[PDB]
Write a protein that binds this ligand. Structure first.
Ligand code: ZVH
Length: 435
């Protein structure tokens, strides 16, 4: 696999050992061949597991989630997928890695898709080798793949709201359950219902993931309510997965706004990754997978693929060339390569709006391509009346950096900046000039 001009897809089923057994063997051989290597982790939780499995080996951890001594002579770097794309974007020298190992190479976040594109172009150009590790490579149509122990699969009506009757099977279970909901707001409602019935619930989402995941190991729990974030290597000591089979999809309507369409069916890869949380211990057969709907290829027309093209168009590769998206997923977006390329100053603003401002890729591009500087928040208030953001059924209000009380009405409307209470809180701080 380590030979140049080769992209290997390590499509071993969930729980085969692609991090504890396979990853250390690859690292040993790369170190032996003097190959400059990058290991890409989907999350900081997965990067911490990798440190444990690669202990002793000379690896430079470019993550604060690891507290180890660095010798200074390490030719293998380890960082998250977003950290990799971020460094490609910033005016920082990134080594020309000979070997590129991406773990959970199915991750659909804009920065993961952009890293797959950039790396796969280098491999296609004959400049490097790559190993994409995932049980569900792009294109998979199997929602029920092989597992370490048998799984009982049940098509059942899964609740998406609080319930009084009709779902005795949910609460009459003794084991621990991982329940995949389509959104934070939907998880809050089910969690309240379970808590009221006497259950201990932990809630996981992209923002609370590193902090809350530790509670799954430090305290007794009956249920873990999670969004699609737990599809990227989250390991649980559970015996049941309840899968609504639904998700929200960010969609660009008319090219002027982003809405959160759905809930709608998850792809076959998401259903297999969600089911993949259980059936992992061959000494405990009979884990349950209760699923509440079917699968469809809903990644077509999803904003993340357009956003990945916005990132790649602003990453230098070779003079006037631009990295293509990884071939099995290049059709999920109708885009022109280079159409999102920004000039040096607008590109710096774009990067700062995503990195410091914490705005979604699409929103940062709208603002940066309009000639607006990072600290100028006038656009958060000069939009049309239908762009008014609502909180508690009343227009959301902030005090501007000028000390004036205004209604939040952004020039560009992205549903993700007000999807939950936490998102709107951070966006109110942004519009106020707080970061
Ligand atoms: O994390 C992602 O994938 C997206 C979501 C918004 C920020 C963006 C990003 C981060 C690193 S490079 C581009």
């Amino acid at each position: 696999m380590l030979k140049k001009k080769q992209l290997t897809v390590l499509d071993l089923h969930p729980g085969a050992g692609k991090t504890r057994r396979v990853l250390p063997e690859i690292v040993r051989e790369a170190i032996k061949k003097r190959l400059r290597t990058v290991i890409l982790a989907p999350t900081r939780v997965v990067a911490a597991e990798m440190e444990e499995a690669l202990r002793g080996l000379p690896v430079r951890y470019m993550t604060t989630a690891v507290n180890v001594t660095h010798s200074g002579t390490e030719i293998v770097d380890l960082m998250c997928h977003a950290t990799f794309t971020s460094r490609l974007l910033q005016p920082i020298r990134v080594p020309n890695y000979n070997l590129n190992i991406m773990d959970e190479a199915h991750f659909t976040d804009p920065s993961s898709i952009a890293a797959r594109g950039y790396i796969s172009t280098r491999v296609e150009m004959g400049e490097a080798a790559a190993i994409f590790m995932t049980a569900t490579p792009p294109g998979t149509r199997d929602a029920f793949p092989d597992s370490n122990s048998p799984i009982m699969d049940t098509e059942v009506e899964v609740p998406e709201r609080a319930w009084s009757s009709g779902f005795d099977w949910v609460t009459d279970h003794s084991g621990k359950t991982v329940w995949f909901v389509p959104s934070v707001r939907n998880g809050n409602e089910i969690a309240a219902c379970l808590t009221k019935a006497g259950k201990r619930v932990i809630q996981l989402s992209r923002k609370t993931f590193e902090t809350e995941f530790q509670k799954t190991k430090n305290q007794e729990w009956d249920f873990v309510i999670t969004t699609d974030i737990s599809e990227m290597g989250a390991n649980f000591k559970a015996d049941r997965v309840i899968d609504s089979r639904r998700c929200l999809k960010p969609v660009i309507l008319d090219g002027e706004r982003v809405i959160l369409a759905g809930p709608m069916p998850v792809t076959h890869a998401s259903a297999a990754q969600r089911r993949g949380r259980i059936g992992r211990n061959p000494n405990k057969p009979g884990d349950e997978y209760m699923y509440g709907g079917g699968c469809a290829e809903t990644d077509e027309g999803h904003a993340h693929w357009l956003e990945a093209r916005m990132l790649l168009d602003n990453i230098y590769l070779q003079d006037g060339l631009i990295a293509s998206l990884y071939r099995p997923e290049a059709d999920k977006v109708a885009a022109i390569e280079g159409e999102f390329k920004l000039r040096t100053e607008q590109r710096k603003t774009f990067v700062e709006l995503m990195k410091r401002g914490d705005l979604p890729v699409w929103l940062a591009y709208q603002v940066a391509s309009a000639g607006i500087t990072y600290t100028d928040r006038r656009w958060c208030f000069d939009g049309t009346t239908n762009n008014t953001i609502m909180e508690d059924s009343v227009p959301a209000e902030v005090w501007t950096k000028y000390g004036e009380k205004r209604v939040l009405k952004p020039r560009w409307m992205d549903a993700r900046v007000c999807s939950d209470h936490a998102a709107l809180k951070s966006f109110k701080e942004f519009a106020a000039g707080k970061r």
